[PDB]
Design a protein around this ligand. Sequence first.
Ligand SMILES: *CC(=O)NNC(=O)C[C@@H]1CCS(=O)(=O)C1
Length: 225
Amino acid sequence: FNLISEKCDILSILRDHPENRIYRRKIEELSKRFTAIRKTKGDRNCFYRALGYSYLESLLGKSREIFKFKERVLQTPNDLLAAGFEEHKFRNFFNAFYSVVELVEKDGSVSSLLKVFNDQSASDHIVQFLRLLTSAFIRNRADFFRHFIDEEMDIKDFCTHEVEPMATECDHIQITALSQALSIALQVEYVDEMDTALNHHVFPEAATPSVYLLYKTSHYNILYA
Ligand SMILES: *CC(=O)NNC(=O)C[C@@H]1CCS(=O)(=O)C1
């Protein structure tokens, strides 16, 4: 369980910041709304790895939701081709993601899904797929990302340097783009060391979340309501 842990009690993370007044306060507050947490490895890939695992776990046993998600995943090669990616270069990554969606359908256990996401090879193939899809979706909607995020940013360079490579840290743009690309609604809880309110953001603004994440160190862990 070196990439995604077993589930633990929310207060078990007090030991990560002992004798830190503000962290203890915010984690005690968080424990009033959430019951459990999984930790993720802090290797620069944890946003992609955590969102992929938590969303697929939320689909287990839901036959209509699985059918609709598979239908969207089967169209994602078209997104990649429209952005200029070549099939022979994304095939191995697409195939790995499609395989784990079929596991959700056919096997349906938490145990088997957690084993794939802790297999360094399968899990890193899945992460690389999600990074190419994120880049494709931004490139195909460049005017949207300039209008609503940052009129001055260089979209092609940003995707090349901060989205596609393994181990590159995320910001708000990648979260928004992958949420929209796969129709995943997620809520992020923000825990920093300032004497401020524990707060959160939903992606997209209006939606009922399927996934909850805890953000603290440039790091994302998985929460359970
Ligand atoms: C989501 C993800 O992989 N985050 N990366 C880390 O947690 C890296 C740590 C935060 C600062 S560091 O790079 O020194 C260790």
